[PDB]
Amino acid sequence: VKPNYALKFTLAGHTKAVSSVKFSPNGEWLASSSADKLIKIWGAYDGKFEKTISGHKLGISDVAWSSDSNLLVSASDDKTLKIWDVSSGKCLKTLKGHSNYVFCCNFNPQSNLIVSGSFDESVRIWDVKTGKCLKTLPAHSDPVSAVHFNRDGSLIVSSSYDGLCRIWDTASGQCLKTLIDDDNPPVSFVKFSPNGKYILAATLDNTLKLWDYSKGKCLKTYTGHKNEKYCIFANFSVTGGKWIVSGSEDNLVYIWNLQTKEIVQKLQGHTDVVISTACHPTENIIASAALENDKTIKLWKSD
Amino acid sequence: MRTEPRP
């Protein structure tokens, strides 16, 4: 099969570059973070604006949802993370500890924990209820690009400009695995597959890679896009055909066939680098976001 | 900021 994504809506509102877009686990909403220091919520199916959330002192590089679609966590250059009640827009907690910009964040599946990654080279695990830092991992020797929990929260995967992807035991804080291929390009993003068996990693040499975690081996490689300067989000699209989706520094969204590694579609519309892509939990919908010269989020749909 | 490029 091949996808046939088409633009349906363009969401406008941010006054500066958009950094991350994420659909609610319930499928109803889309949250967006930006260098304008705000988070905005939008309807996932119509792109209708819903609300704006504020409080950060500096720009936000990432946002993440709780499993019940009720809470959101944000990561900022103000060196803090914030948890928010989406229904009210109120900040429930401000997590402090990082000594430099917080770049990435995610809740575990139970959503009692939040994992964070910073330019301070650390990965931290926090208690959502109290805001306390439960553990600080000396994870890398360079800025941490991404952090993600597996399906049961037993593991955390991390990536860095140091060229490494590492897997950690949530409970112990021990490093269970370090993955690296032949070359050591900086790693700009990482995430577990939805079944937790595989890991998708992006490197700043215009390459995406699929890894079997258990075997510690690279199974697939995806190329064609441009990615050498920015930490762009990538995803597994599993609602229809099995695709790998990513942003690109050529202003396009790329979609590849997971098995053949062929590019099946390139989505044109943005006027600047596509920094983030998100795939809808149940429908064949992709959300895409772009940098300063564009400032828009776009919603695409396929059969 | 993720919106700013790597030097």
From Swiss-Prot, chain A:
Phenotype when changing residue 292 to A: Strongly reduced affinity for histone H3. No effect on interaction with KMT2A
Coiled coil ranges: none
GO biological process, one term: positive regulation of DNA-templated transcription
SMART domains: WD40
Keywords per UniProt: Acetylation, Chromatin regulator, Host-virus interaction, Isopeptide bond, Nucleus, Repeat, Transcription, Transcription regulation, Ubl conjugation, WD repeat
Effect of residue 195 to A: Loss of interaction with RBBP5 and reduced ability to stimulate KMT2A methyltransferase activity in association with RBBP5 and ASH2L
Cross-link (Glycyl lysine isopeptide (Lys-Gly) (interchain with G-Cter in SUMO2)): 16
Chain positions found as N6-acetyllysine: 82
Xref: Pfam families: Beta-prop_WDR5
UniProt WD repeat ranges: 13-52, 55-96, 98-138, 139-178, 182-223, 226-266, 269-303
Keyword Acetylation: yes
Outcome recorded upon mutating residue 291 to A: Abolishes histone H3 binding
Effect of residue 103 to D: Strongly reduced affinity for histone H3
Site residues by UniProt (Important for interaction with histone H3): 77, 103, 233, 292
PANTHER family in the record: WD REPEAT-CONTAINING PROTEIN 5, WD40 REPEAT PROTEIN
Protein family per UniProt: Belongs to the WD repeat WDR5/wds family.
Assembly and binders: Interacts with PAXBP1; the interaction is direct and links a WDR5-containing histone methyltransferase complex to PAX7 and PAX3. Interacts with HCFC1. Component of the ATAC complex, a complex with histone acetyltransferase activity on histones H3 and H4. Component of the SET1 complex, at least composed of the catalytic subunit (SETD1A or SETD1B), WDR5, WDR82, RBBP5, ASH2L/ASH2, CXXC1/CFP1, HCFC1 and DPY30. Core component of several methyltransferase-containing complexes including MLL1/MLL, MLL2/3 (also named ASCOM complex) and MLL4/WBP7. (Microbial infection) Interacts with herpes virus 8/HHV-8 protein LANA1; this interaction regulates the MLL1 histone methyltransferase activity on viral DNA.
Official protein name in the record: WD repeat-containing protein 5
Species assigned in the record: Homo sapiens (Human)
From Swiss-Prot, chain B:
Source organism, top-level taxon: Eukaryota
Function: Represses translation of the downstream SCRIB protein. Translation of oSCRIB hinders SCRIB translation but does not completely abolish it, probably due to leaky scanning which allows the ribosome to bypass the weaker oSCRIB start codon and initiate translation at the stronger SCRIB start codon.
Note: This protein is produced by a polycistronic gene which also produces the tumor suppressor gene SCRIB from an overlapping reading frame.
Name the UniProt record assigns to this protein: SCRIB overlapping open reading frame protein
Organism encoding this protein: Homo sapiens
Lineage: Eukaryota, Metazoa, Chordata, Craniata, Vertebrata
Gene encoding the protein: SCRIB
